[PDB]
Design a protein around this ligand. Structure first.
Ligand SMILES: C[C@@H](CC1CCCCC1)NCc1ccccc1O
Ligand SMILES: [Mg+2]
Lengths: 221, 793, 317, 55
């Protein structure tokens, strides 16, 4: 599947840097999907999150954060993992499907800086699109990182195109997994595989990925 | 959040165009979602006056009009708008003008009378959806002036996404303050002078919940004209921020919300029984909201009430009774600061989402109420008339939130960012943002301004320094870390290695949705209760899949409906089976499943058309299982499955554990799913075969081997693999290979019986064998098939 | 532990992994083999007669004194080795360097990485539902087409009949990619098979790896939501006219509408004059913006028949 | 081949540390096999390796 092509390339890019692939369940609880990420129950990015809930605790995950939280609790730094998997949101348009794939990275060490975030992701984008392309880092907000950023790639039509989100891990997130933010730091990032696959191979309709027409899939052998 | 660029430029006007300003706002952290023009594209429309107005002599509901546009002589215009009358200042599209839609204005006659242009509505100019009548301009409108200049129609509305941290950017002042910092410009602020009271009217205001409301400001205005029209300049600023004009009192309160970010409300003072009580609601209180519906409130919800009844939901929505109506003459202006934690969640509980609730639950400036009250008071009396009383200030200094004092260390700043920003630049950035900064040895002590609700800890100041300094001004640096190897296990079998083998056997990977249609899954897995979504995107995507067969079988039908009968696909993914012993009561196992149908090969000059059968898929499955090196310990036992042909279905066992299923889709299930023909599915529990055998070198005999073929006739219902397994087990270390090469039943063998032709290969590691010991061993093997099975032939 | 930077290095999606090709060959029934780079020049002379190989002064032995000009001497020695141990069916491949003396090459010897293999014996092992048939040319070519299909350039591969002293001249082909020669394939010549004492018919191949170590990066193409049409044609040509060239001409002439060209039958016998053959070809036609009607379908099908007439003197039946 | 399994395992171990695989010809010259390795012509390693020379 073209999304598998994308996930495999990205796993090989970061695998050479010592990043371990980690996977987890797609149904999670509100702790591993919100609370552990510094998202309290009254936080806006939770009720207004297009989330699929089964009850007040069980949900279809909106991110692959559960495996990252569990890994940090089970070992001290250094941490170097990437976490691919399916995630779920309620929207459904030409550029949105209720299910899609997310690749999330995490590294935690002694002197991890924002300069390392830029250099690593700039290396990644240059390898993924195989050109010395124009990128930019842009201020943003996530409850689980500070400083937070989104990175854009210059679109072929002259406009900037949001490609991924990133930031330095919030000290609250490190604290509640038992990591001292005064000693250790780290950055994380997240990106949608459908989006990157469309930009990489020229796919114009995101719904083609899940219609699974053999004439669409056979183009990616 | 929508706002007018020209309105923002009244506060801060950097010498740069709209595209760059919008890019600057996006680079501040307020990503622009769109930039839209304020009006349509046109030219040749100017300000005019209706000098003479008379009945059209040949059309009942038309008027003939003399219009002054500052030219050599007056124009003859025909107008049919109901509001057309003498003395009106109007927008005149003169001859030669082009209106939106390439609508050229030509001199023409309308029902016999000459018309040298037309009087325009907002809809005809593409300004709004108002087509009830022609535009009415202020009485002092400059005749002859381009309405694009007079109405400032060369303007854009900018829509931005405001993340919940930037609570200060939900008003003109907050967006402009951030733009000014990024440009190192000062902020130009309107002169808001307090309105002196000319009467002594008040009313009692007591707060019973000072934690939820640390500051409530009431003010009475006596004798207002609620029917007074909103001036055109306020209607335009409201509209260019996405808010349409309703009535003058709501319009002024919406204006101060847009300008200062402060929500405000107006009560009918004559409908307030006693006074104002800012209190928690009682458990089960009933309030009829302004939209006519009733709300049953909980005791954790703040309400504005009087001495008898509840009047509104504090900082969320107004009630039906106490609001301003047509008969209102005296109003009580509310301007309060509500504690964000006391407001958050209450609007969503009752399906509400208002401009006030959005701002209060994120945080409005607690040092803003007085300035916003004086702004609304002057704007209200300048529009609706009346007299203002004194401001009623109920402020609780104990619960009023305090500005945070934060210490920013040089060590933390350089470590987190990795780039040294000069000391003078750090303290300059923090002060332009509004922080009181005192410098120390490698440290800054900063007091956050009152409007920032995202400045509590050190990292918040790191982001502020970094985002204003410029993310892209920070260089790239590779990570420094230890080169430590991970822990490897040669016994791991990779899923990607299995996907590759399936590709090399003619299988295409597909990915299907994890929630499926329970109507069709109940056909494949009847009786098995699935985990349902209470709020699904649709009922056809409301059941978490119990297997991968629902998605795979929908995929072949999809492709077969598009002229492709032959489909051979697989998928890896989780199944969701309700399990009380599993975490969260639902067991999520990673599965590997697939399906084949149609002919074995595509049309080929040397291969004949033949439909796929059970042993084709089983052969592919044995290739997968052989990657584990444990194929000797795999069993295919016939076993019942409602989705499968009872005579061509098998459960797959590995070391006495059922790891999956395989078989032909049951013909009635094939009918219900509208499958074109014979269809074969499988599914495997992945973790049960994610382990493989690590090789261990065994000695090879340098002595030749011998082959002896036997033909054994057994019962038709005896599985041939058990016979092969008996020859391999009962035989000692002499026989090293057992293989089946023919299965006969017909003319020569009794009915219900079959002949199995088996080849036995014998060899020893130390010596060579001769006919004596050889024939004695095949005789030993065939005698083992005498009691457990049947004789030979 | 080492404290150093973490830099990615440069990847190329267009690279074709040799390990991926080995995995495919394993999944097609092939065992990997590693043979000595120096071989017996007597045997290699039987395979490449007259070709002077770089010889080792003072070798470990005379039977290991000649750098291999190809991988076939070592491969063919491996099957004979196993056949002496009661193993007729041998399906093996090897990757490694060949050493061809060349004055224009560094050190006067050109060292190319090759991918070679050999199959012999029955198509399958003895099986209750698989017919016992000796492996043939189109079995090995099928595995080679599987390998070359990983490049995404299989539509540009050509198998031209070409003479090689080690191969049967009627069942041997030089392999071409985009006009570039990349290898050779065919059954071992019966005289060379009589020598070496091979058990029956054996099939060999060898590919210059770096010639096909690249693959096409996919670019998405639109799918028509309108139905497609199939039209079969019977094309009679002279026997010596390669069937792939008729297929290639059909794909080249119909580019806009003809989305598929496949041969499903080839007949030579009663009904077709001796020395001639009939090729049954399916033409699938589709358009992205509309459904096709009989007038345009017939026009395009006729356009392909006229091109086969011009190039091959073919006739429609 | 069994040694291919070994090579592939070792390549994956060091690949995670950022070690790039590099390959080259098997017939080499005097400089690259000995001289550039601090092994002059008068060094016994040119015979302790027992090298196969062509010239
Ligand atoms: C949701 C997080 C979860 C991780 C964040 C911090 C450490 C716990 C796991 N995914 C990675 C990520 C990072 C930045 C921006 C967007 C983004 O998606
Ligand atoms: Mg912040």
């Amino acid at each position: 599947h073209p999304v598998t092509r994308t996930i495999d390339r990205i796993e090989s890019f970061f695998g050479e840097l010592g990043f371990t692939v980690a996977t987890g369940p797609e149904i999670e609880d509100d702790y591993h999907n919100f609370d552990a990420l510094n998202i309290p129950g009254h936080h806006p990015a939770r009720a207004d999150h297009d989330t699929f809930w089964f009850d007040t605790t069980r949900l279809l995950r909106t991110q692959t954060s559960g495996v990252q939280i569990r890994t940090m609790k089970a070992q001290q730094p250094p941490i170097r993992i990437i976490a691919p998997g399916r995630v779920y949101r309620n929207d459904y348009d030409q550029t949105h499907t209720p299910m899609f794939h997310q690749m999330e990275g995490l590294i935690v060490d002694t002197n991890i800086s924002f300069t390392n975030l830029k250099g690593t992701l700039h290396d990644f984008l240059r390898n993924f699109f195989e050109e010395d392309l124009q990128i930019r880092f842009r201020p943003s907000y996530f409850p689980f990182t500070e400083p937070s950023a989104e990175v854009d790639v210059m679109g072929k039509n002259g406009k900037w195109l949001e490609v991924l989100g990133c930031g330095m891990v919030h000290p609250n997130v490190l604290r509640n997994v038992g990591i001292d933010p005064e000693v250790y730091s780290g950055f994380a990032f997240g990106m949608g595989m459908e989006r990157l696959t469309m930009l990489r191979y020229g796919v114009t309709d995101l719904r083609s990925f899940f219609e699974n027409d053999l004439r669409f899939l056979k183009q990616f052998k | 959040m929508k706002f007018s660029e020209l309105w923002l430029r009244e506060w801060v006007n950097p010498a740069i165009d709209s595209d760059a300003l919008a890019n600057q706002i996006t680079m501040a952290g307020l990503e622009v979602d769109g930039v839209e023009p304020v009006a349509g594209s046109f030219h040749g429309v100017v300000v005019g006056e209706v000098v003479e107005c008379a009945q059209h002599p040949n059309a009942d509901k038309l008027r003939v009009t003399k219009v002054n546009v500052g030219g050599d002589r007056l124009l003859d215009i025909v107008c049919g708008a109901p509001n057309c009358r003498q003395g009106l200042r109007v927008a005149v599209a003169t001859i030669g003008a082009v209106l939106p839609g390439d609508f050229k204005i030509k001199a023409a006659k309308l029902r016999g009378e000459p018309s040298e242009g037309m009087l325009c509505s907002f809809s005809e100019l593409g300004i709004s959806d108002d087509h009830s009548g022609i535009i009415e301009l202020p009485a002092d409108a400059p005749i002859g002036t381009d309405i694009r200049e007079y109405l400032k129609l060369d303007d854009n509305t900018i829509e931005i996404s405001v993340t919940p941290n930037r609570a200060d950017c939900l008003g003109i002042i907050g967006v402009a303050r951030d733009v000014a910092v990024l440009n190192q410009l000062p902020l130009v602020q309107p002169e808001i002078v307090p309105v002196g009271a000319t009467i002594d009217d008040t009313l009692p205001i007591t707060v019973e919940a000072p934690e939820a409301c640390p500051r409530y400001l009431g003010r009475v205005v006596k004798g207002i004209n609620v029917k007074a029209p909103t001036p055109l300049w306020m209607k335009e600023k409201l509209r260019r921020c996405g808010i349409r004009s309703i009535d003058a009192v709501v319009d002024v309160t919406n204006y101060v919300l847009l300008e200062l970010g402060q929500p405000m409300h107006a009560f009918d003072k004559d409908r307030i029984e006693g006074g104002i009580v800012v209190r928690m609601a009682k458990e089960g209180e009933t309030l009829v909201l302004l939209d006519g519906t009733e709300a049953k409130l909980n005791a954790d919800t703040l309400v504005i009430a009087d001495h008898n009844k509840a009047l509104a939901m504090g900082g969320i929505f107004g009630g039906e009774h106490s609001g301003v109506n047509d008969e209102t003459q005296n109003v009580l202006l509310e301007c309060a600061f509500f504690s964000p934690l006391s407001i958050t969640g209450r609007a969503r509980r009752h399906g509400l989402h208002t401009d006030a609730s959005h701002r209060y639950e994120r945080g409005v400036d607690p040092a803003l109420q007085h300035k916003a009250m004086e702004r609304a008071t002057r704007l209200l009396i300048d529009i609706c008339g009346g007299e203002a009383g004194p401001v009623i200030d109920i402020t609780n200094e104990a619960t009023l939130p305090k500005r945070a004092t934060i210490t920013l260390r040089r060590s933390k700043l350089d470590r987190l960012i990795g780039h040294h920003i000069a000391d003078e630049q750090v303290t300059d950035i923090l002060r332009r943002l509004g922080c009181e900064v005192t410098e120390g040895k490698d440290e800054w002590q900063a007091v956050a301004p009152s409007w920032r609700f995202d400045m509590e800890i050190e990292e918040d100041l790191v982001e502020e320094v970094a985002r204003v300094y410029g993310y892209n001004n920070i260089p790239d640096e590779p990570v420094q870390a230890s080169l430590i190897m991970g822990t490897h296990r040669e016994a791991d079998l990779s899923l990607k290695r299995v996907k590759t083998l399936l590709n090399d056997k003619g299988y295409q990977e597909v990915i299907t949705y994890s929630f499926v249609d329970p109507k069709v899954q109940q056909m494949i897995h009847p009786g098995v209760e699935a985990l349902l979504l209470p709020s699904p995107i649709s009922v056809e995507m409301s059941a978490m899949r119990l297997s991968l067969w629902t998605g795979l079988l929908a995929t072949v039908v999809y492709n077969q409906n598009r002229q492709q009968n032959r489909v051979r696909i697989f998928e890896s993914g989780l199944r969701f089976v309700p399990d009380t012993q599993a975490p969260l009561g639902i067991r999520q196992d990673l599965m590997l499943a697939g399906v084949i149908c149609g002919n074995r090969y595509e049309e080929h000059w040397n291969l004949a058309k033949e439909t796929v059968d059970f042993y084709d898929l089983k052969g592919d499955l044995e290739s997968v299982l052989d990657l584990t090196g444990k194929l000797n310990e795999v069993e295919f036992r016939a076993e019942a499955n409602p989705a499968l042909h009872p005579g061509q279905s098998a459960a797959i066992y590995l070391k006495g554990e059922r790891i999956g299923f395989v078989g032909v889709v049951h013909p009635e299930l094939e009918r219900k799913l509208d499958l074109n023909g014979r269809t074969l599915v499988f599914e495997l529990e992945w973790n049960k075969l994610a382990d493989r055998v690590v090789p261990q070198a065994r000695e090879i005999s340098r002595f030749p081997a011998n082959r002896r073929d036997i033909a054994v006739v057994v019962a038709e219902n005896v599985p041939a693999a058990d016979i092969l397994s008996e020859c391999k087990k009962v035989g000692v270390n002499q026989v090293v290979g057992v293989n089946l090469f023919d299965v006969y039943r017909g003319k020569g063998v009794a009915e219900g019986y079959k002949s199995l032709a088996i080849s036995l290969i014998l060899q020893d590691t130390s010596r060579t064998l001769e006919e004596e010991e050889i024939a004695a061993t095949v005789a030993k093997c065939v005698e083992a098939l005498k009691e457990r099975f049947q004789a030979s032939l | 532990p080492v404290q150093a930077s973490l830099i990615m290095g440069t990847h190329r999606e267009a690279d074709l992994s040799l390990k991926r090709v080995k995995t495919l060959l394993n999944d097609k029934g092939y065992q990997e083999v590693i043979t000595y780079s120096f071989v017996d020049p007597k045997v290699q002379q039987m395979i490449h007669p007259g070709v002077e190989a770089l010889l080792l002064p003072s070798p470990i032995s005379v039977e290991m004194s000649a750098m291999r000009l190809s991988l076939w001497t070592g491969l063919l020695a491996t099957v004979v080795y196993n056949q002496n141990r009661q193993q007729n069916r041998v399906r093996i491949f090897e990757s490694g360097l060949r050493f061809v003396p060349d004055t224009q090459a560094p050190l006067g010897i050109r060292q190319d990485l090759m991918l070679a293999g050999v199959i012999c014996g029955n198509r399958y092992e003895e099986h209750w539902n698989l017919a016992k048939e000796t492996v043939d040319f189109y079995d090995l070519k099928g595995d080679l087409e599987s390998v070359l299909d990983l490049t995404g350039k299989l539509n540009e591969v050509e198998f031209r009949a070409e003479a090689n002293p080690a191969l049967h001249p009627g069942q041997s082909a030089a392999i071409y990619l985009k006009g570039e020669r990349i290898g050779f394939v065919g059954v071992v010549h019966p005289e060379l098979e009589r020598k070496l004492d091979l058990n029956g018919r054996t099939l060999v191949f060898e590919l210059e790896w770096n010639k096909l170590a690249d693959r096409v990066v996919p670019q998405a193409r639109e799918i028509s939501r309108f139905p497609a049409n199939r039209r079969d044609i019977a094309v009679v040509v002279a026997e010596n006219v390669p069937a792939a060239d008729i297929l290639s001409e059909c794909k080249k002439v119909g580019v806009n509408q003809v989305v598929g060209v496949n041969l499903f039958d080839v007949y030579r016998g009663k009904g077709v004059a001796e020395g001639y053959k009939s090729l049954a070809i399916s033409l699938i036609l589709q358009d992205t913006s509309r459904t096709l009607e009989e007038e345009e379908i017939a026009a395009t099908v006729a356009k392909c028949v006229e091109a086969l007439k011009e190039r091959f003197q073919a006739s429609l039946r």
